Symmetry: D2
Subunit: 127 residues, 4 copies
């Protein structure tokens, strides 16, 4: 990724927790998109419906969060903290469902691990 | 829009507040994208930087919210309420900034009005 | 939608085919998201895997197209025509697959009809 | 990223050009979002209007492309090639405009370089 390089060159600019969060949002978005599709292709797709939905929700929220986190927030009201908290909660929910399938589907194991890491990164960027 | 028609035909299906919310999310997303671009093209773009950012944030959150709201949430944990609350807060913030420019820029007046309506619809879908 | 109102107020601004295209892109994006989810919830989800994928692809392309079409393109090189042509082709593909399921699933009938209309609107905006 | 890990675990699954393309799409999407915001914050924002628009267009197309490229396409008609070609053309256009500002704005230099690489990766995945 070029998150770190680009933050340093912004005219309103270092912030390690923010860089980690942005990087994880884009990684998690892709991973969740891929997991949704993999689950879709499984013989057992009917057992994976909720996992697919959560993965699609998570991909969408992660892209939004990572994009908003790439912008200057100002010092008055901004959505960044709220959005990162939403992302953390979405990643927590998606992790839980992927994790339940992790013994049966390797793609769900990987996605659960990425969601856990993205949750941690988003929650850490809020403090 | 086809929100109402599609909800009624879902196998897990009426919900007027949900239909209004989805419709408003997509309307607001487009309107905010358009307002960001219009502000970008203004002679006075330098005075509109924060408005442009909020409009881009709002467009992104509205698309995410409207997409998530188009899916079955289940009866355990789901992100829907959290996401709709985030959308409401984003629309409130974006409304406030557009409104400040509404006397000078008609596109900001229209976008403030749409954001206000989307805020109301999202907050109403949470109750 | 507020497409028409916002185009008229842009500082670089009428264009009926462009308004129709933008409106249809957002309508189709929502409809395809909803159809993907409805198909996901069907007893027969395993027969609908390709339809679900095409609907997700279509939702994503329609949002991108509708957002790009909401911006000033300039008079040198721009992506608008290329993107609208891609959207038209995606809508054609998605229509074809939804249509095949239209006898069995009302949500697929509606989505096929919306995709057809969005295809027409995008192709018309290119001429 | 987890692109490679997730492709290998898909039930319909190696493809190096596809992995490189997906990775570059998400990297480029973030970079373009960041460049648009950085240009927005410049004293000279009024000279960067077209660059900002192209960066927003590019971010949107790159996310769509990277998401579609993360899904099984089948062996009949699919949008993948068309979408990757659109992404390549968008990245070419965005590169050209960023490059013109690269002497004045380091964020534009970095974004031009990422766009060039994403263009190459998308065009290579089409062959």
């Amino acid at each position: 990724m070029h998150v770190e390089a680009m933050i340093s060159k912004h005219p309103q600019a270092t912030d390690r927790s923010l860089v980690q969060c942005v990087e994880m949002c884009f990684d998690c978005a892709q991973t969740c998109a891929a997991c949704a599709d993999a689950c879709l292709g499984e013989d057992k797709v009917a057992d994976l419906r909720h996992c697919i939905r959560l993965n699609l929700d998570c991909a969408e929220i992660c892209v939004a969060a990572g994009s908003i986190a790439s912008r200057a927030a100002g010092t008055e009201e901004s959505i960044l903290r709220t959005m990162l908290q939403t992302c953390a909660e979405m990643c927590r929910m998606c992790e839980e469902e992927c994790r339940r399938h992790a013994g049966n589907h390797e793609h769900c194991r990987i996605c659960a691990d990425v969601c856990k890491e993205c949750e941690t990164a988003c929650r850490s960027a809020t403090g």
